[PDB]
């Protein structure tokens, strides 16, 4: 056999990328055995922090007490390893004694990854490199447990008044149905359309419906409905609680290489704005790869950072009517904002992860509990505290669109109050003047909305 | 026409990646015009720092005085823009007044990128106050930026007169080139050429039992032992003239501008000389340019260099290799990549301007022998680069990890020994041969002879 003639960029594959994602984070460590002792460290109450680049094959980390990991001084032990030939069955890394004054490894570690559904488990053995392998077996083993990634609602608390208004069946169904009709109107048969008209849930004015995802979606003023309704939802919600809008989009997690305490803090999700780790959908690899990149860091620099720039650039906004700006923003950024900060679908009763997303027609009573705040569903997305941070951001950009036109087209856009909400008069850049707030404007009953949703799905 | 039905990951392309690389770095800014004024900032002595992700399309940065950019407090102005439809012809970004208490842009900027070979780049354009109306008389608000020179290694790591004089000597430049040339090319030489190298005593290794370095049996012919020993021999004599500490760890890639603004700036001053020099676009050779670019990228550090740093310090990994294997494996993969990762653009010996055409291996003009030539991509000059000795010291230290690894799994099967006044190891189960090749000295300097041998190989 012949060895390679030169080195070649060895980017991680799907299996290697997924392995690194199982490891990246903060772990609580425990030493077991008669010979289980690390210089200057207890046997209990330890932590293991690890990190792997998005497509990297090298493994890094640190092993010390919780306080020392956050302190600026170099931790007592540093991790170095690689994932070549690694898997859930075998992972290996070495420990460097930062106090010994030498980068030479002092210990050799192996581990196996497991899953417990009663966020991760690592267990294996450690070997002192000074000890000889021909000596009696050394009872040195460890067990690690990946620390729970806090949910948004576990860090941003919505008071009972507001939260009670969101989780109400009269509101969950409204939001789902408000999106459902316009999202699917362009694919409904005439029989279905006539039925929605029979209950007053046609998207927009009767016989002049504004489909949201049809061919004329950009020109049919549908965007005006999206902006206005969600601003209407903000106004009433902000009267019950202070809901500051995002000023900037949260940056991706800082690598463990450059800010060890910051990296650790990110996995505690202190401000609730941390990107939840992606989850692998069963028997749907195309969707899993889609969600993964949507949450990656290169998607932040390739897409989310471009949107934050475009929708605050005057020259870019001055070219769009409110109907265009809304439809463009909703179809691209809005849908991606939800899934980027979306956590895994969970059972409302117990909170354990549920791989199968809720069926749109499933109206069981358990789904109505406050535990269900899945951002991937309009029936529950409005419950997530992050929902209101980035929808406040979107709304504020409407003023950038007004300021832009006053610069390039002074006078062609006029403000106006509509339904007790600051808005704009119909004109050259405002296609229509009757925003669609459901049957209230172009016609709540809970049993009716269940029917309408049943018609659609 | 129909608008997109959903968003799709829009990673930068070749043209977009190259644009972001032209911008990333620290610029010296200067405002020109009658209406050229930023609240709380002078017109002269400014700096513009910018950054772009490896495959990103969004542009960020800061604009303030040199001192404030390094200070911990938020700079006076923050940059936001994108590179959609941008190029050397048009680049646009907005400025945010961080003091105003609002993330709303206060100014709108455009610029054109230029190159001057008479600085590493030039940006010039106009700025517009967004409060001012466009129907008003034209505002004389423009700026000019000049990308700051990326310091070379030898501009920050100084080799004393004794050592530097020994490296740039014609008797040493040719030795290093020829020592690599023969074994690197031996497996492709005709018998006529081989006999000639034997006629001058420059056959790689023992006569009639030559150790090709890049042939099929490269891993089993003990050639790796030649690579490790010679460069350790080079270290020993070099470290007698100057203290040259070896790398303990491989320098991490530059910190993104989002997480450490002062650190990002410091990296582009190359303070310790270990900063990765930016890649250069080779003319009419896109395959090599893409290769060099990735070799220097950050994902190559996490995919390759960090794996090598792990493997060659893992006992279980080293215990499976004989020294001849460990040498051949490391040289063909890591060694060659370490050179090109920290390599700067080839420069003319006369002046510091870049020369796109690498020196011809047969070109022995007198100008190439000046100390200015420290191109890491050529053995004729790689030993002059100060970084050369940092990572070659690292490689050498890994040989001891290879001994400690065998002493753990195979105690006694590897024995130390002194060879040519150098700490080494005795021939055995894991040491294939006991006559390292230090050139004609061991298996046989004359400057005219080495010039001949090199001419035989390349012409
Ligand atoms: N869940 C949809 C988008 C969406 C999310 C929340 C909503 O409220 C409405 C729509 C998706 O797959 O992106
Ligand atoms: N020139 C080789 C690397 C190299 C450089 C200097 C040497 O001394 C040896 C090898 C390359 O293209 O990577
Ligand atoms: Zn939404
Ligand atoms: Zn909604
Ligand atoms: Zn070298
Ligand atoms: Zn060399």
mmCIF file of C-alpha atoms in Angstrom, chain B residues 145-399:
data_model
loop_
_atom_site.group_PDB
_atom_site.id
_atom_site.type_symbol
_atom_site.label_atom_id
_atom_site.label_comp_id
_atom_site.label_asym_id
_atom_site.label_seq_id
_atom_site.Cartn_x
_atom_site.Cartn_y
_atom_site.Cartn_z
ATOM 1 C CA UNK B 145 -8.626 54.862 3.153
ATOM 2 C CA UNK B 146 -5.346 52.970 2.765
ATOM 3 C CA UNK B 147 -5.099 49.381 3.999
ATOM 4 C CA UNK B 148 -2.231 49.123 6.468
ATOM 5 C CA UNK B 149 0.783 47.014 5.534
ATOM 6 C CA UNK B 150 0.661 43.532 7.060
ATOM 7 C CA UNK B 151 4.010 43.303 8.893
ATOM 8 C CA UNK B 152 6.323 40.565 7.687
ATOM 9 C CA UNK B 153 7.711 37.960 10.059
ATOM 10 C CA UNK B 154 11.264 39.322 9.887
ATOM 11 C CA UNK B 155 9.869 42.783 10.719
ATOM 12 C CA UNK B 156 8.842 41.482 14.170
ATOM 13 C CA UNK B 157 11.132 38.507 14.958
ATOM 14 C CA UNK B 158 14.742 39.656 14.585
ATOM 15 C CA UNK B 159 17.570 37.179 14.015
ATOM 16 C CA UNK B 160 20.910 38.389 15.348
ATOM 17 C CA UNK B 161 23.831 39.066 13.026
ATOM 18 C CA UNK B 162 25.600 35.780 13.805
ATOM 19 C CA UNK B 163 22.606 33.543 13.042
ATOM 20 C CA UNK B 164 21.181 35.558 10.142
ATOM 21 C CA UNK B 165 24.619 35.645 8.529
ATOM 22 C CA UNK B 166 24.851 31.854 8.729
ATOM 23 C CA UNK B 167 21.438 31.308 7.106
ATOM 24 C CA UNK B 168 21.677 33.654 4.101
ATOM 25 C CA UNK B 169 25.130 32.337 3.187
ATOM 26 C CA UNK B 170 25.322 30.827 -0.328
ATOM 27 C CA UNK B 171 26.929 27.738 1.214
ATOM 28 C CA UNK B 172 23.767 27.239 3.311
ATOM 29 C CA UNK B 173 20.967 28.349 0.968
ATOM 30 C CA UNK B 174 22.125 25.875 -1.687
ATOM 31 C CA UNK B 175 22.636 23.079 0.850
ATOM 32 C CA UNK B 176 19.053 23.312 2.096
ATOM 33 C CA UNK B 177 17.581 23.495 -1.415
ATOM 34 C CA UNK B 178 19.694 20.620 -2.727
ATOM 35 C CA UNK B 179 19.165 18.432 0.342
ATOM 36 C CA UNK B 180 15.413 18.613 -0.300
ATOM 37 C CA UNK B 181 15.661 18.698 -4.100
ATOM 38 C CA UNK B 182 17.487 15.382 -4.523
ATOM 39 C CA UNK B 183 15.331 13.236 -2.236
ATOM 40 C CA UNK B 184 12.156 15.087 -3.273
ATOM 41 C CA UNK B 185 12.798 14.435 -6.979
ATOM 42 C CA UNK B 186 14.964 11.291 -6.908
ATOM 43 C CA UNK B 187 12.074 8.981 -7.811
ATOM 44 C CA UNK B 188 11.575 10.850 -11.129
ATOM 45 C CA UNK B 189 15.216 11.123 -12.286
ATOM 46 C CA UNK B 190 16.641 9.082 -15.143
ATOM 47 C CA UNK B 191 19.659 6.859 -14.535
ATOM 48 C CA UNK B 192 21.893 9.420 -16.259
ATOM 49 C CA UNK B 193 20.821 12.052 -13.725
ATOM 50 C CA UNK B 194 21.078 9.653 -10.773
ATOM 51 C CA UNK B 195 24.655 8.660 -11.626
ATOM 52 C CA UNK B 196 25.551 12.349 -11.938
ATOM 53 C CA UNK B 197 24.307 13.154 -8.433
ATOM 54 C CA UNK B 198 26.319 10.130 -7.296
ATOM 55 C CA UNK B 199 29.293 11.596 -9.169
ATOM 56 C CA UNK B 200 29.207 14.696 -6.950
ATOM 57 C CA UNK B 201 28.231 12.846 -3.766
ATOM 58 C CA UNK B 202 24.689 14.251 -3.573
ATOM 59 C CA UNK B 203 22.718 11.016 -3.788
ATOM 60 C CA UNK B 204 20.006 10.937 -1.088
ATOM 61 C CA UNK B 205 21.437 8.554 1.488
ATOM 62 C CA UNK B 206 23.896 5.677 1.117
ATOM 63 C CA UNK B 207 25.316 5.024 -2.332
ATOM 64 C CA UNK B 208 23.334 2.459 -4.373
ATOM 65 C CA UNK B 209 20.743 2.263 -1.547
ATOM 66 C CA UNK B 210 19.201 5.702 -1.954
ATOM 67 C CA UNK B 211 16.190 6.727 0.143
ATOM 68 C CA UNK B 212 13.658 8.421 -2.112
ATOM 69 C CA UNK B 213 11.423 10.794 -0.160
ATOM 70 C CA UNK B 214 8.319 10.923 -2.387
ATOM 71 C CA UNK B 215 8.344 7.500 -4.040
ATOM 72 C CA UNK B 216 6.092 4.479 -3.493
ATOM 73 C CA UNK B 217 8.253 3.022 -0.693
ATOM 74 C CA UNK B 218 8.637 6.463 0.915
ATOM 75 C CA UNK B 219 7.033 5.278 4.168
ATOM 76 C CA UNK B 220 9.124 2.098 4.509
ATOM 77 C CA UNK B 221 12.567 3.189 3.237
ATOM 78 C CA UNK B 222 13.527 5.081 6.439
ATOM 79 C CA UNK B 223 13.559 8.350 4.469
ATOM 80 C CA UNK B 224 11.613 9.935 7.326
ATOM 81 C CA UNK B 225 14.624 9.463 9.596
ATOM 82 C CA UNK B 226 16.617 11.694 7.242
ATOM 83 C CA UNK B 227 13.971 14.423 7.483
ATOM 84 C CA UNK B 228 13.811 14.450 11.287
ATOM 85 C CA UNK B 229 17.559 14.202 11.891
ATOM 86 C CA UNK B 230 18.788 16.805 9.399
ATOM 87 C CA UNK B 231 16.371 19.481 10.610
ATOM 88 C CA UNK B 232 17.299 18.638 14.204
ATOM 89 C CA UNK B 233 20.947 18.975 13.168
ATOM 90 C CA UNK B 234 19.971 22.357 11.722
ATOM 91 C CA UNK B 235 18.252 23.292 14.989
ATOM 92 C CA UNK B 236 21.219 22.338 17.174
ATOM 93 C CA UNK B 237 23.733 24.510 15.321
ATOM 94 C CA UNK B 238 21.217 27.351 14.964
ATOM 95 C CA UNK B 239 20.227 27.331 18.646
ATOM 96 C CA UNK B 240 23.903 27.691 19.614
ATOM 97 C CA UNK B 241 23.920 31.189 18.067
ATOM 98 C CA UNK B 242 20.522 32.367 19.355
ATOM 99 C CA UNK B 243 17.748 31.337 21.735
ATOM 100 C CA UNK B 244 14.975 29.998 19.460
ATOM 101 C CA UNK B 245 12.150 28.615 21.626
ATOM 102 C CA UNK B 246 9.910 26.141 19.832
ATOM 103 C CA UNK B 247 6.151 26.523 19.583
ATOM 104 C CA UNK B 248 4.241 25.013 22.490
ATOM 105 C CA UNK B 249 0.936 25.306 20.612
ATOM 106 C CA UNK B 250 -0.031 26.233 17.086
ATOM 107 C CA UNK B 251 -1.229 29.863 16.888
ATOM 108 C CA UNK B 252 -5.010 29.976 16.779
ATOM 109 C CA UNK B 253 -6.731 31.708 13.844
ATOM 110 C CA UNK B 254 -7.587 35.388 14.080
ATOM 111 C CA UNK B 255 -10.424 36.132 16.493
ATOM 112 C CA UNK B 256 -13.532 37.439 14.672
ATOM 113 C CA UNK B 257 -14.107 41.177 14.908
ATOM 114 C CA UNK B 258 -17.459 40.535 16.624
ATOM 115 C CA UNK B 259 -15.996 38.960 19.772
ATOM 116 C CA UNK B 260 -12.635 40.701 20.358
ATOM 117 C CA UNK B 261 -12.261 44.054 18.604
ATOM 118 C CA UNK B 262 -8.843 44.884 20.150
ATOM 119 C CA UNK B 263 -7.585 41.353 19.536
ATOM 120 C CA UNK B 264 -8.690 41.446 15.903
ATOM 121 C CA UNK B 265 -6.760 44.697 15.429
ATOM 122 C CA UNK B 266 -3.656 43.362 17.184
ATOM 123 C CA UNK B 267 -3.592 40.276 14.948
ATOM 124 C CA UNK B 268 -3.153 42.488 11.872
ATOM 125 C CA UNK B 269 -0.083 44.097 13.444
ATOM 126 C CA UNK B 270 1.508 40.618 13.542
ATOM 127 C CA UNK B 271 3.086 41.422 16.937
ATOM 128 C CA UNK B 272 4.574 37.991 17.681
ATOM 129 C CA UNK B 273 5.244 37.349 13.979
ATOM 130 C CA UNK B 274 3.066 34.217 14.163
ATOM 131 C CA UNK B 275 0.001 35.726 12.469
ATOM 132 C CA UNK B 276 -1.121 33.986 9.280
ATOM 133 C CA UNK B 277 -0.206 36.212 6.305
ATOM 134 C CA UNK B 278 -3.234 36.811 4.059
ATOM 135 C CA UNK B 279 -3.446 34.631 0.971
ATOM 136 C CA UNK B 280 -2.576 35.960 -2.483
ATOM 137 C CA UNK B 281 -4.340 35.288 -5.783
ATOM 138 C CA UNK B 282 -2.013 33.518 -8.207
ATOM 139 C CA UNK B 283 -2.310 34.719 -11.799
ATOM 140 C CA UNK B 284 -3.735 32.246 -14.330
ATOM 141 C CA UNK B 285 -3.702 29.481 -11.686
ATOM 142 C CA UNK B 286 -7.087 29.339 -9.958
ATOM 143 C CA UNK B 287 -6.530 25.790 -8.686
ATOM 144 C CA UNK B 288 -3.456 26.867 -6.706
ATOM 145 C CA UNK B 289 -5.106 30.056 -5.443
ATOM 146 C CA UNK B 290 -8.105 28.148 -4.083
ATOM 147 C CA UNK B 291 -5.686 25.625 -2.563
ATOM 148 C CA UNK B 292 -3.567 28.284 -0.849
ATOM 149 C CA UNK B 293 -6.645 30.156 0.387
ATOM 150 C CA UNK B 294 -8.148 27.148 2.157
ATOM 151 C CA UNK B 295 -4.753 26.097 3.498
ATOM 152 C CA UNK B 296 -4.794 29.446 5.343
ATOM 153 C CA UNK B 297 -8.506 29.483 6.228
ATOM 154 C CA UNK B 298 -9.835 28.854 9.729
ATOM 155 C CA UNK B 299 -11.766 25.686 8.856
ATOM 156 C CA UNK B 300 -8.479 24.173 7.669
ATOM 157 C CA UNK B 301 -7.066 24.818 11.146
ATOM 158 C CA UNK B 302 -9.947 22.905 12.752
ATOM 159 C CA UNK B 303 -10.032 20.175 10.083
ATOM 160 C CA UNK B 304 -6.300 19.496 9.624
ATOM 161 C CA UNK B 305 -3.776 21.433 11.734
ATOM 162 C CA UNK B 306 -5.630 20.772 14.989
ATOM 163 C CA UNK B 307 -5.856 17.072 14.086
ATOM 164 C CA UNK B 308 -2.106 16.892 13.454
ATOM 165 C CA UNK B 309 -1.395 18.716 16.720
ATOM 166 C CA UNK B 310 -3.514 16.027 18.399
ATOM 167 C CA UNK B 311 -2.257 12.913 16.593
ATOM 168 C CA UNK B 312 1.475 13.574 16.976
ATOM 169 C CA UNK B 313 1.029 14.045 20.731
ATOM 170 C CA UNK B 314 -1.222 11.004 21.276
ATOM 171 C CA UNK B 315 0.754 8.001 22.612
ATOM 172 C CA UNK B 316 -1.561 5.400 21.064
ATOM 173 C CA UNK B 317 -1.139 7.068 17.659
ATOM 174 C CA UNK B 318 2.652 7.387 17.828
ATOM 175 C CA UNK B 319 3.189 3.847 19.158
ATOM 176 C CA UNK B 320 2.037 2.405 15.806
ATOM 177 C CA UNK B 321 4.731 4.123 13.701
ATOM 178 C CA UNK B 322 8.424 3.560 13.201
ATOM 179 C CA UNK B 323 10.556 6.692 13.128
ATOM 180 C CA UNK B 324 10.880 6.303 9.357
ATOM 181 C CA UNK B 325 7.090 6.270 9.055
ATOM 182 C CA UNK B 326 6.533 9.142 11.495
ATOM 183 C CA UNK B 327 9.044 11.252 9.577
ATOM 184 C CA UNK B 328 7.650 10.546 6.116
ATOM 185 C CA UNK B 329 4.043 11.016 7.255
ATOM 186 C CA UNK B 330 4.732 14.340 8.969
ATOM 187 C CA UNK B 331 6.900 15.776 6.186
ATOM 188 C CA UNK B 332 4.511 15.043 3.314
ATOM 189 C CA UNK B 333 1.431 16.362 5.118
ATOM 190 C CA UNK B 334 1.991 18.782 7.985
ATOM 191 C CA UNK B 335 5.488 20.107 7.234
ATOM 192 C CA UNK B 336 4.630 21.245 3.705
ATOM 193 C CA UNK B 337 1.367 22.796 4.922
ATOM 194 C CA UNK B 338 3.062 24.610 7.811
ATOM 195 C CA UNK B 339 5.376 26.318 5.321
ATOM 196 C CA UNK B 340 2.597 27.579 3.051
ATOM 197 C CA UNK B 341 0.228 28.523 5.892
ATOM 198 C CA UNK B 342 2.670 31.047 7.389
ATOM 199 C CA UNK B 343 4.178 31.936 4.004
ATOM 200 C CA UNK B 344 4.153 35.534 2.822
ATOM 201 C CA UNK B 345 3.988 36.599 -0.807
ATOM 202 C CA UNK B 346 7.185 36.183 -2.806
ATOM 203 C CA UNK B 347 9.037 39.496 -2.955
ATOM 204 C CA UNK B 348 11.817 40.973 -5.051
ATOM 205 C CA UNK B 349 15.184 40.967 -3.233
ATOM 206 C CA UNK B 350 15.942 44.503 -4.440
ATOM 207 C CA UNK B 351 12.784 46.195 -3.119
ATOM 208 C CA UNK B 352 9.946 44.967 -0.920
ATOM 209 C CA UNK B 353 7.293 44.943 -3.653
ATOM 210 C CA UNK B 354 5.560 41.612 -4.406
ATOM 211 C CA UNK B 355 6.779 39.428 -7.273
ATOM 212 C CA UNK B 356 4.038 37.216 -8.705
ATOM 213 C CA UNK B 357 6.498 34.827 -10.394
ATOM 214 C CA UNK B 358 8.181 32.534 -7.873
ATOM 215 C CA UNK B 359 11.928 32.113 -8.227
ATOM 216 C CA UNK B 360 12.919 29.478 -10.755
ATOM 217 C CA UNK B 361 14.668 26.539 -9.034
ATOM 218 C CA UNK B 362 17.572 26.967 -11.473
ATOM 219 C CA UNK B 363 17.648 30.774 -11.101
ATOM 220 C CA UNK B 364 20.788 31.587 -9.082
ATOM 221 C CA UNK B 365 21.012 35.331 -9.786
ATOM 222 C CA UNK B 366 22.959 37.251 -7.106
ATOM 223 C CA UNK B 367 19.942 39.291 -5.970
ATOM 224 C CA UNK B 368 18.041 36.277 -4.610
ATOM 225 C CA UNK B 369 20.816 35.772 -2.032
ATOM 226 C CA UNK B 370 19.974 38.935 -0.069
ATOM 227 C CA UNK B 371 18.444 38.540 3.417
ATOM 228 C CA UNK B 372 15.223 40.091 2.082
ATOM 229 C CA UNK B 373 14.326 36.699 0.551
ATOM 230 C CA UNK B 374 12.691 34.541 3.238
ATOM 231 C CA UNK B 375 9.991 32.897 1.121
ATOM 232 C CA UNK B 376 8.747 29.876 3.070
ATOM 233 C CA UNK B 377 7.630 28.049 -0.083
ATOM 234 C CA UNK B 378 11.222 27.362 -1.181
ATOM 235 C CA UNK B 379 13.912 25.389 0.706
ATOM 236 C CA UNK B 380 16.471 27.768 -0.813
ATOM 237 C CA UNK B 381 15.046 30.500 1.450
ATOM 238 C CA UNK B 382 12.565 28.930 3.901
ATOM 239 C CA UNK B 383 15.191 28.566 6.643
ATOM 240 C CA UNK B 384 15.570 32.367 6.724
ATOM 241 C CA UNK B 385 11.993 33.022 7.852
ATOM 242 C CA UNK B 386 11.903 33.343 11.669
ATOM 243 C CA UNK B 387 8.678 31.317 11.743
ATOM 244 C CA UNK B 388 10.611 28.444 10.136
ATOM 245 C CA UNK B 389 12.406 27.767 13.417
ATOM 246 C CA UNK B 390 9.275 27.981 15.585
ATOM 247 C CA UNK B 391 7.352 25.181 13.876
ATOM 248 C CA UNK B 392 10.437 23.111 13.034
ATOM 249 C CA UNK B 393 11.218 23.251 16.738
ATOM 250 C CA UNK B 394 7.671 22.026 17.327
ATOM 251 C CA UNK B 395 8.111 19.145 14.869
ATOM 252 C CA UNK B 396 11.380 18.156 16.543
ATOM 253 C CA UNK B 397 9.848 18.076 20.029
ATOM 254 C CA UNK B 398 7.296 15.569 18.715
ATOM 255 C CA UNK B 399 10.130 13.074 18.183
#
